[PDB]
Design a protein around this ligand. Structure first.
Ligand SMILES: [Mg+2]
Lengths: 207, 255, 226, 51, 51, 221, 40, 216, 49, 279
RNA sequence: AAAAAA
C-alpha cells in the first residue's frame, strides 16, 4: 500500500443497573460534538459523535438540508464495513424526520460517529440506541433544529426509536431474538427512551 | 424526480381513506413480474426477474467445498448494481441486509447443506441488478428465492470428498422472502411503485420464512423529504398485512 | 564578462539614480536591489540576460499566438503551451467594426503585439501596433510552418540585425518570415522543400548555438533535400 | 380569525393544557450519576497552561 | 451533398421563401418566424421603458 | 566530495538538471510559470507542485516526506510574489539509491535539493538567494563527522544528518539555514561541531555549483 | 502520510525497539485437557 | 406570559391561536413560528391539533412589531447575506470587467460583526462578485479595476442582489465602502493605511499604491 | 498542560478480568489543550527466514 | 401477483441494414439513415426504405423522439442557468427555453424550477437538432392537477390539436415526444376550440384544492388504458383512449387492468372493432 | 450557448 504503512504483507494478525455518562461540546474542530458512555452488566460502550454543519453546497438547488452519517471503528476492528453502512442508512432514516430540513436550503449536514471502545463479556444492535443518543445530543449542541428529541432502546435484539414522548416511532430495527415480543419490546424500549430523553435534556441544560 | 405538483397530488390520493393508487392497485396487490430460471449451465443455479417499471435482477447460484468447522457462514450473498460502485452506500447496505436475511442461523437451515461430518457445501449467491427504479431489496429477494428452488449440485457418493460424475442433487429448501412496505399517511401499502415511494411518509422492510414473519425487520426511509414519524399501530397493521398475503405470493412463485 | 548570481551584492552604487528592468527585483520592504536570475548584467539601463524557455507577458512585445477559443467578448489565444490564455479583443484588428466580427477560426496563427500585460491580470494583445503603419506583418499567418525555440534565440533574431540567420537564409532561398518573442518563429516559402530546409536549419542552429556555424549548417541542409 | 370559532380557542387551549399535563408532566426514573466510565474523565478536560 | 446536409438546407430555404408579410394590426397573436410584421408585440412601449 | 552535474538535459521542459553524488543520482525537471489548477491557485503568491519518485517501486509515504522537506527549502528561495496566481511543477526522479533506501533517505534528500535548485536556475525563475545541501553522518566508533559519506559508511553510522544553507553575496555570506535534518543518537556538542564543518563544506559546494552554471549558461548568451 | 512515516522513521532512528526485543519465545501444548508450558 | 420560559427541542410552547379578555373586548393574539420554532401537528382525543414547538434549546422570546412572534434564542447560522447588509470580503482574483471575492464576515445591526467560519482552501466559503460599474458612483462607465482592488486586499462592501445561488453582487459606491486593510506589493511589503478615497499610502516604507479606500 | 490515560483501552487493563475479544496490546489517551489523541497498539506474528 | 416461469431459455417495403447499398442512382436527395460515397447510397441504420419525391432516406426500426417545428410536447425542467431553461423532452438533447419565450406577469427559480413539468411548442430548431421551446399561449403553461405517464414516442402521431377532453371530467395532453399528462378538466379545457369560432396563478405549484375521488380514479383508469395500448404497441389517439376507457369498464376494480392478459384484451378489442366497422 | 439581410 502506497497510501499508508500496512507493514509486512507476509505476516498475520493476532490469533487467540443502567449507567450513563454524557458530555457535549468538547471538540472545537466542528460545530457540535457529543460523548456517550454506557455501562451495564458485563457490557460497556463508549462512542463519540461529531457534527460538521450546516455548510453551504455550491450550485445546490435543494430546498431542504442533506444529512450524511458515517460510523467508524475507533479501536477494536469488529463490525463489518458493510454493516456500518446499514446502520448509517438506518440512522439517516431517523434524523430526516427529526431534523427540521426546511431550515437549511442549499445546505448539507455531515455527521461522523466514532465507535471508540466497546467491551462485551445481534451484536451491534445494543449500540444503536447509544448512537441515536449521541447524534441527537451533537445536533442539538451544534444548533441544528430538531422537531423532537430522538431516543431509542434495545430489547432482545429489537431496537425501536421514539419521538413525541413515545407516542410515535422514527425507527425500527429487528434482528434475531424471537417472536411475539412486539408488545413487550415496544414497552421496554419506551422506558429506555424516556430515561435517555430526560438525561439528554438535562445534559444540554447543565453545562 | 417528480414536480411538487405531482407529489402533492399523489400524496393527497394515497393518504385518503379510500386510498387510490396511481395504477389502481389495492393496498395488497402486487405488480405482474416475470421469472426465468436455470439459464446458466456454468452455474449451479440462476434466476432472472423482470418488473413492471423495467427493473431487472439476475441472481447466480454457485458452490464449492470447505470445512464447516472453520467456516461459520456457508452462505455468501454478493450484490452488484449496474452503474454503481461496490463500496456504494446502497449497495453495501443491501449486501449486509441480504446476508442477514439468508444466514445459517437466521432463515436458512444449516443441516440442508450438510454432506459429511467434515466437509459441507458452501453456497455463493451473486446478484446483478440490470435496472432499478426503486428499492431492489424486494426484487432481489424474489430472484434469490426462485434461484434456490431450482439448483443442482454434484451428487455425493460416500457418507459420514467424492462426487457423482453425472447425476446431481437438487437442493430443496425454504428460502426467505423480503417484502418492502410503504407508509403513507395512515395507510399501509405493499410493493411500492417508483413514484409512490417518493411521497411516502415512511417504509418497512419485512422478512418471511416458513409461513411466519421473521428477522430482519427494518424501517427504511423510501425518500429523504416527506419522511415523518408513524404511529405504532401502523407497524402492527403492516406486519399483519404481510402475514396474511404472504401465502398468496409464495403460492404464486412456487409454480 | 561579468557573471551574476542571485543574492549577490549589486555592484552599481545606490547613489546615482538607475532605472530598473527585467532580471532585477526591488524588495517591497527592505528596498534593496538584488539579482534574482543567473546571467550577464548589461549596464548602459539595468537588466539581466538569463536563459529561459518560458515566455511571460510584457508590454510592447511581438508574439505569435494560436487561437484556442472564440468567445463573444474577445479571443482566447495561447502564446505558448500550458501558459495562461491571452485576451485578443475584436476591436484589436485594423478596420474594426461593431456588429461585424473579424474572421478567425480556432487554430489560426496570429501575429500581434502585447498592449496591456499585468502580473495579476489576464494579458491582452492587439493585431495592430500602436503604431507602425498598422502593418509590421500583423494579422493572420496563412499556411507556412512554425518552430519552437528558446527565448534567447528569438529576441536576438528579431532585434539584433547582426545575427547571421536572416542574412544567410536570404541567400539560400527567398521567403517572408515573422518572429515572436515567445520563442515562436513562423517562416513561409513557395515550395514546401524550402520551408522544410528552413525548419531543419533553425532546429540545428538553436541546438548547437554557434554564430559562425550558421553558414555551414545552411549549406548542408539545402543540399540534403536534393 | 372571525371565521374560526372563538370559544374553540378556549377549547384548543384546554386540549393543550391537558396535553402537556398528560405528557411531559409524567416522568420518573432512578437518578444515575454522570460519573465517567472510561473517556469521560479526560476528554472534556478544561484547558490549562503551564510556564 | 458529400456531407448529406443538402436536404436540410433546401428545407430551411423553402421556409424562408414562404415567409409572408402582414401588417402589425392583423398579425398572429403567436410570434413565429413564418410571418413578418413591423411590430410583433401587443405593447411595444413596454420594452422601450425597461431599456 | 567530488560531484558532477549537467544543465538542460530535457527538451520539452522549461528547465531541468541532472545531479550526481557518489552513487546516488537524482535528475530533476521544472516547468513554469504555467497555468495552475483551480485547487492550486494562490491569489498573491506562486504555487509549488513538488513530486519525488524513488528508484525502485512506487512513491510511498517515504517520498511524501521527501517532498515535504524539499518544499521547505525551495519555498523561501523562489520569489512567489513575482508570479501571482501561477504554477511551478518541480519533479525529482531518483535514478539510483546510492545507499540503503530502506534505512536512510537523507542522502537522496540532499541530492533532490541540489538538483531542484539547479533546475530552478535553468528554468529562469526569480530566486531570492542561492542554496546548497550536503549529507552528513557520524560513526558510532570513530565518533568523527564525515561530510558526504558513502553507502557503507551509513550502515555503521550512529546518526545521520542533512544540512541545507542559503548563501548571499558571492556565495560567501550565509543569510539563514533553510533545512536542518538529523536522525540518530547525538548530543549538543556534536551539533555545533556539525555546522562548523558543514558550513565550510557547504560553501565549498556553493562555489563549486556557481562555476557549473557559468560554464553552461554563458555559451547560450 | 508524512506523520505515519515520521513516527516510523524517528522510532527506527532513535533506536527504541531492537529486533531482539520482538523475538517470539514459543511453547508447547500437550494433552494431560491441555497444559501449556514455556521454557525458562 | 403564562407559557414556559425555558424550552428544549420538542417542548410545547403555545397553541396556534390565542385570545384574552380586557377592556370589555376580546383581543386576539396571533402566534407565528420563528427562528428556533416549528409549527407541527399533534393528535389527542381523536382530534388533530396544531401548536408551536421549539426546535432549539434556549429561552423563548415573545415580541411584537408595528400579532405575537414566538422565537427561541440559543445560549452564525441565522446570519446570512441579504440585500442591504454590509459585508467584509477578501479579493480572490481580478478580471477586467469585474472582481470576484469571498465573504468572510457580515456587519450586524444596532460596531459588531458576525464571522462566517469556513475552509478557505476548499471553496466552501461563500463567493461574491463586484461589478466594474459598482466600484464607485463617480464615472460608472470607465473604471480601471487594477487601480481599484488588489488580490488579498480586504474590501468592505454592501450586497445589492443575491442573484443566483453561487455568487453575491456587492458594491463600493458610497464613502464608507472600499479597501480597508491592505499591504504593499500584494502583501509582500508593509501595512498600508487609507488617506484619500482613491489613494492608499504606507507610513513605513513610503510606498503609495492606488486603491479604492473607505472613509475612516 | 498534558494529561493522559494509559492502559485504559488495552485488554490488559484489568488484572483479574481480561478481555477475550480485545486485541489491543497497549494503549494511551492524550489531550494537550484542545487536541485529543487516542493511540492503540496491535500486534502480529511473522515467520523469520 | 402474476408470474411467468420458463425454463431452459433466457409499392413494397424494403428492409435494409447498415452497409447495404439501397440504390445506384445518385439523382435522389440524401436523407436520414443514408450516407454518400462515390455516387452510391448506403444505409447507415436498419429499417425500411423511404422513397418520397426526390428525398431518399431510411426509417429506423426504433429511435428517440425527433423534434419538429410545431410539435406539441410535454417536458420536465432539467436545469436552470443564466437566462435560459433547459427542458427534457426525452429527445437526444435538452430543449432550451429562453426567458423571452415565456409569459411574464405584473430569480427564475420562482417561476420554473428543476422537476416542474410543462407543455410547450417547438418554436424553432438549432443546427445540432436541439429544439427551442415556446410557451406563449393560453393552451401552454405549467402542468398540474393530475398525473404523468410515459409511452413510446412512435405511438403518438402529429395532429392539429393534441389536447383532448374526455368523459369523466379529465383532460389528456398527448405529446409527440411520448410524454403524456392527464389532468382535471378546467375552464380553459372545457371551452377552448369553441370560443375561437364564437396571470400569476399560471406558475403556481399547488393543485386544485378540491379533487373529487371520481376524477382521481378517472385519471387513474385513463392512465392504465393508455399504457395498455402502449403495451400492445398501438398508436394512441383520442378515439383509442375513449374506446379503451369504455372497454375497461367491464372490470369493476381498476387494479385488474395492470395484468398482461387484461391489457392485451383491451388492445385486441379495439383492433377488431375498428376492423369490423371499418370495412 | 453570439449568429444573418438593409
Ligand atoms: Mg457495480
Amino acid at each position: 500500500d502506497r497510501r499508508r504503512l500496512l507493514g509486512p504483507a507476509a505476516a498475520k494478525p493476532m490469533a487467540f443497573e443502567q449507567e450513563l455518562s454524557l458530555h457535549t461540546g468538547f471538540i472545537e474542530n466542528c460545530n457540535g460534538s457529543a460523548l456517550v458512555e454506557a455501562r451495564s452488566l458485563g457490557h460497556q460502550t463508549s462512542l463519540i459523535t461529531a457534527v460538521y454543519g450546516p455548510r453551504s453546497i455550491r450550485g445546490s438547488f435543494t430546498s431542504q438540508g442533506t444529512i450524511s452519517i458515517q460510523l467508524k471503528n475507533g479501536l477494536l476492528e469488529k463490525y463489518n464495513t458493510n454493516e456500518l453502512k446499514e446502520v448509517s442508512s438506518f440512522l439517516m432514516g431517523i434524523f430526516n424526520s427529526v431534523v427540521n430540513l426546511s431550515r437549511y436550503p442549499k445546505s448539507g449536514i455531515d455527521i461522523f460517529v466514532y465507535l471508540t471502545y466497546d467491551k462485551d463479556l445481534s451484536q451491534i444492535s445494543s449500540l444503536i440506541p447509544h448512537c441515536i443518543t449521541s447524534i441527537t445530543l451533537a445536533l442539538a449542541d451544534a444548533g441544528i433544529e430538531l422537531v423532537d428529541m430522538a431516543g431509542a432502546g434495545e430489547a432482545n435484539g429489537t431496537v425501536v426509536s421514539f419521538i413525541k414522548n413515545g407516542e410515535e416511532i422514527v425507527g425500527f430495527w429487528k434482528d434475531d431474538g424471537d417472536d411475539e415480543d412486539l408488545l413487550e419490546c415496544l414497552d421496554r424500549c419506551k422506558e429506555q427512551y424516556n430515561r435517555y430523553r430526560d438525561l439528554m435534556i438535562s445534559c444540554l441544560m447543565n453545562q | 424526480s417528480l414536480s411538487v405538483a405531482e407529489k402533492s397530488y399523489l400524496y393527497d390520493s394515497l393518504a385518503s381513506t379510500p386510498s387510490i393508487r396511481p395504477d389502481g392497485r389495492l393496498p395488497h396487490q402486487f405488480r405482474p413480474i416475470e421469472i426465468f430460471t436455470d439459464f446458466l449451465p456454468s452455474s449451479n443455479g440462476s434466476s432472472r426477474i423482470i418488473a413492471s417499471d423495467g427493473s431487472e435482477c439476475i441472481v447466480s447460484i454457485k458452490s464449492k467445498v470447505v470445512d464447516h468447522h472453520v467456516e461459520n457462514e456457508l452462505l455468501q450473498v454478493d450484490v452488484d448494481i449496474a452503474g454503481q460502485r461496490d463500496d456504494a452506500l446502497v449497495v453495501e447496505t443491501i449486501t449486509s441486509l441480504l446476508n442477514k436475511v439468508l444466514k445459517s442461523g437466521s432463515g436458512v437451515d444449516s443441516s440442508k447443506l450438510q454432506l459429511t461430518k467434515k466437509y459441507s457445501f458452501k453456497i455463493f449467491v451473486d446478484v446483478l441488478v440490470i435496472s432499478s427504479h426503486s428499492h431492489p431489496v424486494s426484487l432481489i429477494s424474489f430472484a434469490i428465492y426462485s434461484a434456490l428452488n431450482s439448483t443442482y449440485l454434484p451428487k455425493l457418493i460416500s457418507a459420514f470428498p467424492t462426487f457423482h460424475d453425472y447425476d446431481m442433487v437438487k437442493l430443496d429448501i425454504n428460502p426467505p422472502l423480503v417484502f418492502i412496505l410503504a407508509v403513507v399517511g395512515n395507510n399501509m401499502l405493499l410493493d411500492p411503485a417508483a413514484n409512490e415511494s417518493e411521497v411516502a411518509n415512511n417504509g418497512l422492510i419485512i422478512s418471511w420464512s416458513n409461513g411466519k414473519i421473521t428477522s430482519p425487520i427494518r424501517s427504511v426511509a423510501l425518500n429523504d423529504s416527506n419522511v415523518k414519524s408513524f404511529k405504532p399501530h401502523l407497524l402492527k397493521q403492516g406486519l399483519a398485512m404481510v402475514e396474511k398475503y404472504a401465502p398468496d405470493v409464495v403460492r404464486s412463485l412456487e409454480n | 564578462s561579468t557573471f551574476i548570481f542571485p543574492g549577490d551584492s549589486f555592484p552599481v552604487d545606490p547613489t546615482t539614480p538607475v532605472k530598473l528592468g527585467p532580471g532585477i527585483y526591488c524588495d517591497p520592504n527592505t528596498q534593496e536591489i538584488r539579482p534574482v536570475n543567473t546571467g550577464v548584467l548589461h549596464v548602459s539601463t539595468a537588466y539581466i540576460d538569463y536563459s529561459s524557455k518560458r515566455y511571460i507577458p510584457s508590454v510592447n512585445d511581438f508574439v505569435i499566438g494560436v487561437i484556442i477559443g472564440t468567445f463573444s467578448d474577445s479571443y482566447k489565444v495561447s502564446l505558448q503551451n500550458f501558459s495562461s490564455s491571452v485576451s485578443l479583443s475584436y476591436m484589436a484588428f485594423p478596420n474594426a467594426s461593431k456588429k461585424n466580427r473579424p474572421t478567425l477560426q480556432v487554430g489560426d496563427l496570429v501575429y500581434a503585439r502585447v498592449c496591456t500585460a499585468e502580473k495579476e491580470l489576464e494579458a491582452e494583445i492587439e493585431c495592430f501596433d500602436s503604431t507602425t503603419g498598422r502593418d509590421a506583418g500583423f494579422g493572420i499567418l496563412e499556411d507556412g510552418m512554425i518552430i519552437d525555440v528558446n527565448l534567447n534565440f528569438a529576441r536576438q533574431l528579431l532585434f539584433n540585425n547582426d545575427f547571421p540567420l536572416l542574412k544567410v537564409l536570404a541567400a539560400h532561398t527567398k521567403f517572408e518570415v515573422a518572429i515572436g518573442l515567445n520563442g515562436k518563429i513562423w517562416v513561409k516559402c513557395e515550395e514546401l522543400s524550402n520551408t522544410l530546409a528552413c525548419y531543419r536549419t533553425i532546429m540545428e542552429c538553436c541546438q548547437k548555438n554557434d554564430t559562425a556555424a550558421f553558414k555551414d549548417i545552411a549549406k548542408r541542409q539545402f543540399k540534403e533535400i536534393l | 380569525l372571525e371565521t374560526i370559532s372563538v370559544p374553540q380557542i378556549r377549547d384548543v387551549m384546554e386540549r393543550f393544557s391537558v396535553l402537556c399535563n398528560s405528557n411531559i408532566s409524567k416522568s420518573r426514573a432512578k437518578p444515575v450519576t454522570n460519573s465517567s466510565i472510561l473517556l469521560g474523565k479526560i476528554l472534556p478536560r478544561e484547558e490549562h497552561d503551564i510556564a | 451533398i458529400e456531407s448529406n446536409k443538402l436536404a436540410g438546407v433546401l428545407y430551411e430555404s423553402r421556409n424562408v421563401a414562404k415567409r409572408r408579410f402582414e401588417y402589425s394590426k392583423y398579425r398572429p397573436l403567436t410570434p413565429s418566424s413564418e410571418v413578418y410584421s413591423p411590430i410583433e408585440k401587443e405593447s411595444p412601449w413596454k420594452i422601450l421603458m425597461y431599456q | 566530495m567530488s560531484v558532477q552535474a549537467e544543465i538542460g538535459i530535457l527538451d520539452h521542459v522549461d528547465g531541468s538538471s541532472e545531479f550526481v553524488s557518489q552513487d546516488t543520482k537524482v535528475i530533476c525537471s521544472v516547468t513554469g510559470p504555467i497555468e495552475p489548477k483551480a485547487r492550486q491557485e494562490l491569489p498573491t503568491q506562486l504555487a509549488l507542485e513538488i513530486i519525488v519518485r524513488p528508484a525502485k517501486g512506487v512513491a510511498t509515504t517515504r517520498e511524501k516526506v521527501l517532498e515535504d522537506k524539499l518544499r521547505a527549502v525551495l519555498t523561501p528561495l523562489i520569489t512567489r510574489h513575482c508570479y501571482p496566481r501561477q504554477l511551478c511543477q518541480i519533479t525529482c526522479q531518483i535514478l539510483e539509491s546510492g545507499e540503503d533506501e530502506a534505512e536512510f533517505s537523507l542522502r537522496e534528500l540532499s541530492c533532490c535539493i541540489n538538483a531542484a535548485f539547479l533546475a530552478l536556475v535553468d528554468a529562469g525563475i526569480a530566486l531570492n538567494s542561492m542554496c546548497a545541501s550536503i549529507p552528513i553522518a557520524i560513526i558510532k566508533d570513530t565518533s568523527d563527522i564525515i561530510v558526504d559519506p558513502t553507502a557503507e559508511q551509513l550502515k555503521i553510522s550512529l546518526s545521520v544528518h542533512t544540512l541545507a544553507l542559503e548563501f548571499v553575496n558571492g556565495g560567501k555570506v550565509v543569510k539563514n539555514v533553510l533545512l536542518l535534518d538529523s536522525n540518530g543518537d547525538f548530543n549538543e556538542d556534536q551539533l555545533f561541531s556539525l555546522l562548523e564543518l558543514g558550513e565550510q563544506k557547504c560553501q565549498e559546494l556553493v562555489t563549486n555549483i556557481r562555476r557549473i552554471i557559468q560554464d553552461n549558461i554563458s555559451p547560450r548568451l | 502520510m508524512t506523520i505515519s512515516q515520521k513516527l516510523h522513521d524517528s522510532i527506527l532512528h532513535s533506536r527504541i525497539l531492537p529486533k531482539k526485543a520482538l523475538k517470539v519465545k514459543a511453547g508447547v501444548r500437550s494433552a494431560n485437557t491441555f497444559s501449556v508450558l514455556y521454557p525458562d | 406570559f403564562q407559557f414556559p420560559e425555558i424550552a428544549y427541542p420538542g417542548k410545547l410552547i403555545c397553541p396556534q391561536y390565542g385570545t384574552e379578555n380586557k377592556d370589555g373586548e376580546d383581543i386576539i393574539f396571533n402566534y407565528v413560528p420563528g427562528p428556533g420554532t416549528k409549527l407541527i401537528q399533534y393528535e389527542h382525543n381523536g382530534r388533530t391539533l396544531e401548536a408551536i414547538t421549539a426546535t432549539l434549546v434556549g429561552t423563548v422570546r415573545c415580541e411584537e412589531e408595528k400579532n405575537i412572534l414566538v422565537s427561541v434564542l440559543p445560549g452564525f447560522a441565522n446570519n446570512l447575506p441579504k440585500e442591504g447588509d454590509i459585508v467584509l470580503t477578501r479579493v480572490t482574483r481580478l478580471s477586467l470587467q469585474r472582481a470576484n471575492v469571498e465573504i468572510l464576515a457580515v456587519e450586524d445591526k444596532p460596531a459588531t460583526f458576525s464571522v462566517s467560519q469556513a475552509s478557505s482552501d476548499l471553496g466552501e466559503t461563500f463567493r461574491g462578485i463586484i461589478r466594474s460599474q459598482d466600484v464607485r458612483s463617480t464615472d460608472r462607465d470607465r473604471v480601471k479595476v487594477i487601480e481599484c482592488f488588489k488580490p488579498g486586499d480586504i474590501v468592505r462592501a454592501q450586497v445589492l442582489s443575491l442573484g443566483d445561488g453561487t455568487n453575491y453582487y456587492l458594491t463600493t459606491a458610497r464613502n464608507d465602502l472600499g479597501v480597508v486593510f491592505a499591504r504593499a506589493a500584494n502583501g509582500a511589503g508593509g501595512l498600508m493605511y487609507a488617506t484619500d478615497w482613491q489613494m492608499m499610502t504606507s507610513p513605513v516604507t513610503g510606498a503609495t499604491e492606488k486603491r479604492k479606500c473607505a472613509k475612516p | 498542560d498534558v494529561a493522559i490515560e494509559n492502559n485504559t483501552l488495552s485488554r490488559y487493563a484489568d488484572a483479574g478480568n481480561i478481555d477475550t475479544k480485545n486485541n489491543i496490546l497497549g494503549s494511551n489517551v492524550l489531550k494537550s489543550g484542545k487536541t485529543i489523541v487516542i493511540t492503540s497498539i496491535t500486534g502480529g506474528i511473522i515467520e523469520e527466514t | 401477483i402474476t408470474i411467468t416461469k420458463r425454463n431452459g431459455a433466457f409499392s413494397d417495403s424494403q428492409i435494409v441494414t447498415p452497409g447495404e447499398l439501397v440504390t445506384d442512382d445518385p439523382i435522389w436527395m440524401r436523407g436520414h439513415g443514408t450516407y454518400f460515397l462515390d455516387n452510391m447510397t448506403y444505409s447507415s441504420v436498419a429499417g425500411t426504405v423511404s422513397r418520397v419525391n426526390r428525398l431518399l432516406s431510411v426509417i429506423p426500426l426504433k429511435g428517440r423522439y425527433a423534434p419538429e417545428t410545431g410539435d406539441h410536447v410535454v417536458g420536465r425542467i432539467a436545469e436552470v442557468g443564466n437566462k435560459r431553461w433547459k427542458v427534457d423532452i426525452g429527445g437526444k438533447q435538452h430543449a432550451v427555453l429562453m426567458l423571452g419565450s415565456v409569459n411574464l406577469p405584473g430569480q427564475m427559480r420562482s417561476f420554473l424550477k428543476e422537476g416542474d413539468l410543462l407543455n410547450a411548442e417547438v418554436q424553432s430548431l438549432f443546427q445540432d437538432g436541439s429544439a427551442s421551446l415556446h410557451t406563449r399561449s393560453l393552451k401552454y403553461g405549467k402542468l398540474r392537477n393530475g398525473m404523468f405517464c410515459q409511452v413510446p414516442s412512435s405511438l403518438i402521431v402529429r395532429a392539429k390539436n393534441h389536447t383532448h377532453n374526455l368523459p369523466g371530467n379529465i383532460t389528456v395532453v398527448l405529446g409527440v415526444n411520448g410524454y403524456i399528462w392527464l389532468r382535471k378538466t378546467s375552464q380553459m379545457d372545457l371551452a377552448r376550440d369553441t370560443p375561437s369560432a364564437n396571470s400569476w396563478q399560471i406558475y403556481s405549484d399547488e393543485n386544485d384544492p378540491s379533487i373529487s375521488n371520481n376524477i382521481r380514479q378517472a385519471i387513474c383508469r385513463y392512465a392504465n388504458v393508455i399504457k395498455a395500448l402502449a403495451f400492445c404497441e398501438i398508436g394512441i389517439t383520442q378515439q383509442r383512449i375513449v374506446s379503451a376507457y369504455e372497454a375497461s369498464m367491464v372490470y369493476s376494480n381498476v387494479g385488474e387492468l395492470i395484468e398482461k392478459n387484461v391489457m392485451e384484451s383491451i388492445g385486441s378489442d379495439i383492433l377488431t372493432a375498428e376492423k369490423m366497422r371499418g370495412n
